[PDB]
Design a protein around this ligand. Structure first.
Ligand SMILES: NC(=O)c1ccc[n+]([C@@H]2O[C@H](COP(=O)([O-])OP(=O)(O)OC[C@H]3O[C@@H](n4cnc5c(N)ncnc54)[C@H](O)[C@@H]3O)[C@@H](O)[C@H]2O)c1
Ligand SMILES: NC(=O)c1ccc[n+]([C@@H]2O[C@H](COP(=O)([O-])OP(=O)(O)OC[C@H]3O[C@@H](n4cnc5c(N)ncnc54)[C@H](O)[C@@H]3O)[C@@H](O)[C@H]2O)c1
Ligand SMILES: Cn1cc2c(C(=O)O)ccc(NS(=O)(=O)c3ccc(OCC4CCC4)c(Cl)c3)c2n1
Lengths: 271, 244
């Protein structure tokens, strides 16, 4: 019975589909080049991080990959090398502040000064507020938003000198609206969306032009991060990476995946 | 305006208010004392929270104070057991407490960022997590998350603060959706989102509201069970225009 009312939403998503693809062709945004840039990607051992390193390797960039999974990040670097990119990896606990700072100095003593940051890394512990463990909540924030500050903080001094960079904050639709069982996770993803919103307002207020900001906000991505989605599309690992590579190149502030989820958030502010 | 929202009574309820030694917290305890509530105040400032309780007592309310570091998890849990061994089971929570360290991302201290999150959102999980089971049992409560317009859109110099306030607005939104998904009706949620309030929290504004005006907006939003208490109410249409 509920499927009858659901066709109104289905018609508006196909309405946005032709409308968005018409703007991407009729009056399209200026695509830039990321060739020879120092692109650091945290959580690049699998999924959205792994396929972002594949997309940057296609653009002829200088990759630096960070992860806790030594094997996973090494295998991503292996397939990024098989594309022609210069790739150098480091096993970094992207939630630990003293490890991040320790590895930033090794990045400058080996690769140089990072010019593009991809704060992809994340952790999820799906449970109701009363069954979630305190350690899980702490680890959620430590990786999803606290860690974003230390990476951003250690690379921004150099991007400020050169007035050239790009801070990519990878968050989810759980940064625009909360879902059940993921309250600690949604709270951290909302914080990530606000950190990019404040970074964008403060970069602008300080006269900084050269440093752009992009925020990836997709729905369920088939990566194994969780088991099944929360509500009745499941984006693929590679489809999301193509959306992120295309959003960084046009310098878009909010990369919604799939884009129509912007009109759904508009309708939320009408009760 | 024509047929406006149903105002409820909060008389005889157990209202816990964190960060109630001054400003938005102090004037919320004054407004609840007017509503004839049983009050419980938490703060790090022993003198400030005792003086709020003193003026709340001079109104007729029964106020009990506890000096609690509302950012420390083991202190919060330790004091929740003292709240149940003295007052009883809390029925209304006011997550007011907050800390701000106004600076650019490169001049902010790491300790400041840590303390920002520890008070503004990490602390909001432990107090709610410990007061929620009895509320769940009784199917009656109200979780008030005090956030700022820095939870809907980021401002310069307050990036660590805006990041935590956004998290508070999302915790409220996630809690709301999960409360609904689990069949719980009796537990309502309100989120206070005002602009610059003259309290001395921050030196200069980012209209500028007064200490007491914001407290009246919060007391009126809890009584009508409104999910988003924007102060002032029109700042909702300004956020709509931002997505254009
Ligand atoms: N997959 C989804 O359903 C989905 C949807 C929207 C947004 N996202 C966001 O994308 C990110 C990851 O998604 P995914 O599907 O690529 O996940 P994934 O589980 O496939 O891979 C994430 C990677 O992060 C790494 N990582 C985790 N904790 C780390 C830490 N402390 N230090 C360093 N590396 C660490 C893991 O080793 C892993 O390789 C998260 O920030 C998440 O919020 C995911
Ligand atoms: N005042 C504003 O400009 C403004 C605007 C919007 C939202 N807010 C929100 O209101 C809250 C406080 O605003 P205010 O004007 O009432 O502030 P205030 O500085 O006047 O008082 C805040 C109170 O919180 C207490 N507190 C701080 N850290 C604490 C801790 N670790 N444990 C226990 N108590 C602690 C302080 O002792 C103080 O009495 C914050 O959550 C803030 O984000 C304030
Ligand atoms: C368990 N689990 C983890 C998920 C993650 C993740 O781990 O990041 C992201 C999305 C999920 N669910 S979803 O894809 O079904 C979905 C679709 C649409 C949405 O919102 C649509 C908008 C907001 C109102 C209209 C939203 Cl919030 C969610 C997830 N489910």
């Amino acid at each position: 019975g509920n499927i009858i009312l659901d066709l109104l939403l289905l018609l508006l998503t196909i309405i946005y589909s032709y409308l968005e693809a018409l703007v991407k062709v009729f009056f399209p945004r200026k695509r830039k080049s990321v060739a020879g840039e120092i692109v650091l990607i945290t959580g690049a051992g699998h999924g959205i991080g792994r396929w972002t390193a594949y997309e940057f390797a296609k653009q002829k960039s200088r990759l630096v990959l960070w992860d806790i999974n030594k094997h996973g990040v090494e295998e991503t670097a292996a397939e990024c090398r098989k594309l022609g990119a210069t790739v150098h990896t480091f096993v970094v606990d992207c939630g630990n502040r003293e490890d991040i700072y320790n590895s930033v100095k090794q990045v400058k003593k080996e690769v140089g000064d990072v010019t593009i940051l991809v704060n992809n890394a994340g952790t999820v512990y799906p449970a109701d507020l009363l069954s979630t463990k305190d350690e899980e909540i702490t680890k959620t924030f430590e990786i999803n938003i606290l860690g974003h500050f230390w990476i951003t903080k250690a690379l921004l001094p150099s991007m400020i000198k050169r007035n050239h960079g790009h801070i990519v904050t990878v968050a989810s639709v759980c940064g625009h609206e909360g879902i059940p069982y993921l309250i600690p996770y949604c709270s951290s993803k909302f914080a990530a969306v606000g950190f990019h919103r404040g970074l964008t307002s403060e970069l602008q207020a300080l006269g900084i032009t050269g440093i752009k900001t992009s925020c990836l906000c997709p729905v369920f991505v088939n990566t194994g991060f969780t088991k099944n989605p929360s509500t009745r599309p499941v984006l693929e690992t590679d489809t999301v990476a193509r959306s992120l590579i295309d959003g960084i190149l046009t310098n878009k502030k909010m990369i919604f995946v799939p884009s129509y989820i912007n009109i759904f958030l508009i309708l939320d502010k009408f009760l």
